[PDB]
């Protein structure tokens, strides 16, 4: 038993073995401000680089969201889907982890933090915890600036960690604004109500839909808008031509001040509390080692604020839950196994001698994991439970003789 | 499409016009922006 | 449905019949066109 202590302090832990699916998703992240035009250019440049790798056969890149409620992606967010050639076509010395390394090393732009995941695994994780990456940290609180400061510090300590490849915390207020601060007194001068002025904002400047042409089963949007030259920039908006109700010819600045500002980019809420998610990408190391190393760096190099909490979520949240159920699961298995032996043989000290044969079966399993280079996971845990019942099975057929 | 500055730069100096967002983001992340503000 | 040109192109030049290449709500036409050359 004392020899099984060497492989124990050697192996690492994961929630589950990373299952290889034919294809994988590229799900990079960036700061809140990016424009659609730029993000869509980012998408094509990123796609050409992915396609430049011999193992990938198709790259279906996506920015924004598809037309379904099952997709709430911003135009600033990219969810490109990579298909890989049959495993029979990969270069001689190749593995899935080796392909991802060439991808992560080939496909990289400034200010862009990449993330590579299996499709199915990803969709399950986001549905279960929200995080798109295996490792995730959740900064919560009621002050957006506070949680953002917190997530900012954590993000930088995270990158100091040995096994981390990238770490980016989404901002809760990195959004850019052009405020049209309508002046009631100024507008009243021209007999205009706030609603009167705003029509130029939603229609003249913005391209608000106004109606829909009917064409058989199909429908298409109709809109009203000034040519772009009039709404090019803040200064342009300050000269936005307005025909008043009394036919006075004025500019938008005559009834409003227009000021650039910063504010909420997108308001993530969990159980009615604001929250920012930090996406960490480590794939060389095992998960549990990284999370524990993050938990240290964070606790030591980041002093918490009052109403701000930090939580580790992602698969790790699942790992912890499964572990708690397993540690409670052994006694169960150990009392029942004890009773079935107790029933067949009827001898206490003897039945106790058989159930006491399983610790020797455990050590056999750990040593094999270590040699195979495997990690502890809900998979291996299961194996050890089933293995116990087989070592107790043997024990009975050795005692019966 | 052009903008006039009252100060801040010097003729001859080179400024980025394309890929400006991502590059700025990088400078923001690498602490360059905070460094810029602290110096003055 | 067809616009006449006073000048700019030569008879025979091929042109793409689509303004459906820049997003309406907000690509800056000036710079969204720039991305197409270099």
């Amino acid at each position: 038993v004392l020899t099984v202590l060497w492989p124990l302090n050697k192996v690492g832990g994961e929630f589950l073995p990373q299952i290889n699916e034919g294809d994988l998703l590229y799900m990079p992240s960036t700061l809140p401000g990016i424009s659609a035009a730029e993000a869509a250019s980012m998408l094509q440049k990123t796609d050409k680089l992915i396609m430049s790798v011999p193992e990938v056969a198709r790259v279906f890149g996506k920015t924004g969201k598809a037309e379904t409620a099952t997709d709430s992606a911003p135009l600033e967010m990219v969810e490109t889907t990579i298909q890989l050639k049959p495993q029979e076509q990969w270069r001689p010395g190749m593995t899935m982890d080796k392909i991802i390394e060439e991808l992560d090393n080939t496909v990289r732009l400034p200010g862009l933090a990449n993330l590579w995941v299996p499709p199915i695994r990803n969709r399950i994780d986001m549905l279960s915890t929200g995080i798109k990456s295996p490792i995730g940290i959740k900064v919560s609180g009621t002050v957006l600036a506070d949680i953002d400061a917190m997530a900012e510090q954590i993000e930088e300590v995270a990158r100091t960690v040995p096994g981390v490849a990238s770490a980016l915390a989404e901002r809760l207020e990195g959004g850019r604004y052009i405020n049209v601060e309508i002046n009631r007194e100024k507008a009243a001068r021209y007999g205009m109500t706030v609603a009167d002025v705003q029509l130029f904002v939603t229609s003249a400047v913005g391209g608000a839909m106004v109606g829909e042409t009917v064409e058989g089963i199909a429908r298409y949007p109709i809109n009203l808008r000034y040519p772009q030259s009039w709404r090019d920039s803040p200064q342009a908006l300050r000269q936005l031509p307005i025909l008043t109700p009394m036919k006075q010819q004025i500019t938008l600045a005559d009834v409003a001040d227009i000021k650039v500002s910063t504010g909420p980019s997108m308001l993530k809420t969990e159980n009615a509390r604001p929250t920012s998610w930090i996406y960490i990408d480590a794939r060389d190391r095992d998960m549990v080692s990284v999370v524990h190393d993050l938990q240290k760096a964070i606790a030591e190099k980041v002093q918490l604020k009052p109403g701000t909490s930090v939580a580790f979520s992602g698969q790790f949240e699942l790992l912890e839950r499964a572990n708690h159920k397993l540690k409670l699961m052994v006694p169960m298995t150990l009392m029942i196994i004890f009773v079935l032996l107790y029933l067949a043989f009827r001898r206490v000290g003897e039945a106790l001698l058989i159930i006491s044969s399983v610790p020797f079966a455990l050590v056999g399993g750990i040593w094999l994991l270590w040699w195979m280079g495997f990690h502890l996971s809900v998979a291996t845990g299961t194996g050890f439970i089933a293995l116990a019942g087989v070592a107790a099975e043997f024990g009975v057929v050795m005692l019966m003789y | 499409g052009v903008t006039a500055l009252r100060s801040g730069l010097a003729e001859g100096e080179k400024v980025v016009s394309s890929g400006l967002f991502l590059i700025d983001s990088e400078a923001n992340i690498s602490g360059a922006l905070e460094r810029m503000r602290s110096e003055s | 449905g067809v616009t006449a040109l006073r000048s700019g192109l030569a008879e025979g030049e091929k042109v793409v019949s689509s303004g459906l290449f820049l997003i309406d709500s907000e690509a800056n036409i000036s710079g969204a066109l720039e991305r197409m050359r270099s």
């Binding site: 400034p110 | 003729e11 100096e13 080179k14 980025v16 890929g19 590059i23 400078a27 110096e39 | -």
Partner: peptide, 26 residues
């Protein structure tokens, strides 16, 4: 050191463009 360094291949891929600063009337 003020500023930030970036791999020339990434910037080339990004298609970075630069414009020189001049003085004159707007």
């Amino acid at each position: 050191a003020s500023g930030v360094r970036i791999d020339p291949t990434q910037t080339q891929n990004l298609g970075v463009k630069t414009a020189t600063v001049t003085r004159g009337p707007l």
